[PDB]
Design an enzyme around this catalytic site. Structure first.
Site, mmCIF file in Angstrom:
data_model
loop_
_atom_site.group_PDB
_atom_site.id
_atom_site.type_symbol
_atom_site.label_atom_id
_atom_site.label_comp_id
_atom_site.label_asym_id
_atom_site.label_seq_id
_atom_site.Cartn_x
_atom_site.Cartn_y
_atom_site.Cartn_z
ATOM 1 N N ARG A 83 0.823 -1.188 0.000
ATOM 2 C CA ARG A 83 0.000 0.000 0.000
ATOM 3 C C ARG A 83 0.881 1.272 0.000
ATOM 4 O O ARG A 83 0.930 1.984 -1.006
ATOM 5 C CB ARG A 83 -0.929 -0.055 1.210
ATOM 6 C CG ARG A 83 -2.066 0.987 1.247
ATOM 7 C CD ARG A 83 -3.448 0.320 1.488
ATOM 8 N NE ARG A 83 -3.331 -0.976 2.183
ATOM 9 C CZ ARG A 83 -4.232 -1.966 2.129
ATOM 10 N NH1 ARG A 83 -5.349 -1.826 1.402
ATOM 11 N NH2 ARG A 83 -4.018 -3.101 2.805
ATOM 12 N N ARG B 157 20.654 -5.276 8.995
ATOM 13 C CA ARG B 157 20.257 -6.676 9.080
ATOM 14 C C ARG B 157 21.337 -7.587 9.677
ATOM 15 O O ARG B 157 21.018 -8.608 10.301
ATOM 16 C CB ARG B 157 19.865 -7.194 7.708
ATOM 17 C CG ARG B 157 21.006 -7.840 6.939
ATOM 18 C CD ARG B 157 20.612 -8.153 5.498
ATOM 19 N NE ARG B 157 21.738 -8.741 4.762
ATOM 20 C CZ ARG B 157 22.796 -8.051 4.306
ATOM 21 N NH1 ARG B 157 22.901 -6.736 4.505
ATOM 22 N NH2 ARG B 157 23.771 -8.677 3.664
HETATM 23 N N1 LIG Z 1 17.943 -16.741 0.500
HETATM 24 C C1 LIG Z 1 18.993 -16.072 1.262
HETATM 25 C C2 LIG Z 1 19.938 -17.182 1.791
HETATM 26 C C3 LIG Z 1 21.197 -16.770 2.563
HETATM 27 C C4 LIG Z 1 20.919 -15.761 3.649
HETATM 28 O O1 LIG Z 1 20.091 -16.026 4.518
HETATM 29 N N2 LIG Z 1 21.612 -14.613 3.572
HETATM 30 C C5 LIG Z 1 21.576 -13.530 4.559
HETATM 31 C C6 LIG Z 1 22.983 -12.971 4.814
HETATM 32 S S1 LIG Z 1 23.802 -12.250 3.528
HETATM 33 O O2 LIG Z 1 24.085 -13.157 2.388
HETATM 34 O O3 LIG Z 1 23.020 -11.096 3.012
HETATM 35 O O4 LIG Z 1 25.090 -11.818 4.095
HETATM 36 C C7 LIG Z 1 20.600 -12.421 4.236
HETATM 37 O O5 LIG Z 1 20.199 -11.636 5.109
HETATM 38 N N3 LIG Z 1 20.204 -12.376 2.966
HETATM 39 C C8 LIG Z 1 19.402 -11.286 2.460
HETATM 40 C C9 LIG Z 1 18.044 -11.698 1.923
HETATM 41 O O6 LIG Z 1 17.648 -12.885 2.056
HETATM 42 O O7 LIG Z 1 17.364 -10.802 1.353
HETATM 43 C C10 LIG Z 1 19.593 -14.913 0.429
HETATM 44 O O8 LIG Z 1 19.195 -14.697 -0.763
HETATM 45 O O9 LIG Z 1 20.449 -14.156 0.967
#
Ligand SMILES: N[C@@H](CCC(=O)N[C@@H](CS(=O)(=O)O)C(=O)NCC(=O)O)C(=O)O
Ligand SMILES: N[C@@H](CCC(=O)N[C@@H](CS(=O)(=O)O)C(=O)NCC(=O)O)C(=O)O
Ligand SMILES: N[C@@H](CCC(=O)N[C@@H](CS(=O)(=O)O)C(=O)NCC(=O)O)C(=O)O
Ligand SMILES: CCCCCC/C=C\CCCCCCCC(=O)O
Ligand SMILES: CCCCCC/C=C\CCCCCCCC(=O)O
Ligand SMILES: CCCCCC/C=C\CCCCCCCC(=O)O
Ligand SMILES: CCCCCCCCCCCCCCCC(=O)O
Ligand SMILES: CCCCCCCCCCCCCCCC(=O)O
Ligand SMILES: CCCCCCCCCCCCCCCC(=O)O
Ligand SMILES: CCCCCCCCCCCCCCCC(=O)O
Ligand SMILES: CCCCCCCCCCCCCCCC(=O)O
Ligand SMILES: CCCCCCCCCCCCCCCC(=O)O
Ligand SMILES: CCCCCCCCCCCCCCCC(=O)O
Ligand SMILES: CCCCCCCCCCCCCCCC(=O)O
Ligand SMILES: CCCCCCCCCCCCCCCC(=O)O
Ligand SMILES: CCCCCCCCCCCCCCCC(=O)O
Ligand SMILES: CCCCCCCCCCCCCCCC(=O)O
Ligand SMILES: CCCCCCCCCCCCCCCC(=O)O
EC number: 4.4.1.20
Lengths: 145, 145, 145
Positions: B31, B104
């Protein structure tokens, strides 16, 4: 009691560790090819790793659900055995897809056979459980005639 | 019986409510920034909220699986405690990522410590369970020599 | 024992089969509109099918978690009944969204009512369980005064 679910729990933990491994691989693909959050698109060798992990994650709950139901209503050892076959196929599958989209297909089918099998077992167990009392209740109604 | 899984069930329900909250936040981001289905791309402040919810969802089953196995094969109170720590870290994490990609990372690590810990507990419990009988069976074989 | 979780297991298996059906539909949309892995974007009639399956998958664990907790701490028959209502709403929902983004909304609300209800039941059961002993322990402390 936990003596009869311990294999199922063991295969379950194995699946978690596998998913953890996929996750760590997506993290290191982000570094290697410099694709950074947000953003889940980039070079194709990044996308294949990303998509492999996601496809695996979207099936993890199905595997779990059906693993426990089959394990409890059919036979714990057989369920655990399909569980291993499934997970191993999922490994080969994540590794294939990372090299090449086309390489994902063979181990995808393997994983589908193992999962469909667990579903068959789950359904047979629940039949064995519900069907007797259902048929009896039906027959009681036909008395008298 | 349910007297010894009630904490685990309580933490489980808490996790569902958290995920429900993330979902509602993604709905209201749609939204606010006018990004509408299909379409999961738009302004970056939309994408961060979307991705935070998705990342959380892809870990929810891992948390659950490992919460129950640790809770049952190790110790219910300790498992529930990591469960809370994990979920709280996941909150801080969804809120960080929504403001800023970089925010994050701190709470992601917190959530990873808590989850890895539940895995350690799960593995220790299953060792305690399988190892005794395995070692005995091995030793029986060495008789006689 | 399995006599009191068999309905829950039955509804659980029904949910797996539904998710399997969604998956097969996404596979055949990929063929029809020639969108091929990686790549989760293409013609909008492809994206709606993709997104319907994904949205459903991201809720499957919530449904499961809350189905089991409600089923065990409240009442098995009522939980199973919401479970069916939920899944049926999820069907109507996948079929709506595939035709038209706008058609997703009515059955989404239906599925939300059924799920929120399972959450209410889950919370009531856990209250019934924890509240007695909590209030007693509190009152014991007020003795003496
Ligand atoms: N599906 C995830 C799997 C791996 C993961 O959980 N990554 C973390 C850490 S990092 O790779 O960013 O250091 C994350 O917060 N991913 C961001 C997201 O999922 O949008 C990804 O695309 O990143
Ligand atoms: N991941 C979801 C989380 C929130 C959600 O479930 N949204 C609903 C309702 S709405 O936001 O569209 O009103 C939906 O059908 N989302 C569409 C989709 O997931 O493709 C999303 O991106 O929308
Ligand atoms: N979400 C999946 C659901 C269906 C599925 O699991 N498809 C398989 C087989 S196929 O459609 O490609 O033949 C796959 O490996 N999908 C690739 C992927 O998920 O990236 C998708 O987008 O494809
Ligand atoms: C999502 C899967 C549900 C797992 C259900 C496990 C029930 C175990 C109780 C039966 C003990 C014999
Ligand atoms: C996906 C997680 C599976 C949960 C398994 C729960 C089994 C409970 C039965 C043991 C009662 C003591
Ligand atoms: C993720 C959901 C957890 C399911 C928990 C099932 C526990 C069953 C044991 C109680 C038997 C009565
Ligand atoms: C009977 C075969 C079952 C094997 C399950 C063992 C799982 C080990 C995974 C760690
Ligand atoms: C239910 C598992 C998914 C099945 C995908 C493989 C079948 C190819 C057609
Ligand atoms: C008492 C109601 C029994 C109906 C349950 C149906 C289970 C079918 C299992 C497949
Ligand atoms: C428990 C009693 C079993 C009832 C007998 C029903 C016979 C149908 C099975 C074939
Ligand atoms: C021992 C500490 C365990 C606390 C679990 C309580 C969960 C409450 C969540 C609602
Ligand atoms: C298994 C949880 C995911 C771990 C991600 C955090 C570790 C950073 C490297
Ligand atoms: C009887 C088969 C026992 C093998 C189970 C292995 C469990 C390892 C747990 C970690
Ligand atoms: C059940 C009997 C326990 C068998 C003893 C095995 C000893 C190895 C444990 C250390
Ligand atoms: C009491 C009603 C419960 C019905 C559950 C039966 C599930 C059948 C799904 C196959
Ligand atoms: C927790 C389920 C998701 C709720 C989405 C429907 C509510 C519309 C606002
Ligand atoms: C002993 C600790 C009890 C605290 C558990 C809280 C459960 C709340 C359930 C809603
Ligand atoms: C178990 C004993 C029940 C304790 C009584 C507590 C009364 C509060 C319930 C209202």
């Amino acid at each position: 009691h936990k003596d009869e679910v311990a294999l199922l729990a063991a295969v379950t933990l194995l699946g978690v560790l596998l998913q953890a491994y996929f996750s760590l691989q997506v993290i290191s693909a982000r570094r290697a090819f410099r694709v950074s959050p947000p953003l889940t698109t980039g070079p194709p060798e990044f996308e294949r790793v990303y998509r492999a992990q996601v496809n695996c994650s979207e099936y993890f709950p199905l595997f779990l659900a059906t693993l426990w139901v089959a394990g409890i209503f059919f036979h714990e050892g057989a369920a655990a055995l399909c569980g291993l076959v499934y997970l191993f196929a999922r490994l080969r599958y994540f590794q294939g897809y990372a090299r090449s989209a086309q390489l994902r297909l063979a181990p995808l089918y393997a994983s589908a056979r193992a999962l469909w099998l667990l579903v068959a077992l789950a359904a047979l167990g629940l039949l064995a459980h519900f069907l007797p009392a259902a048929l009896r209740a039906a027959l009681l109604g036909r008395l008298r005639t």
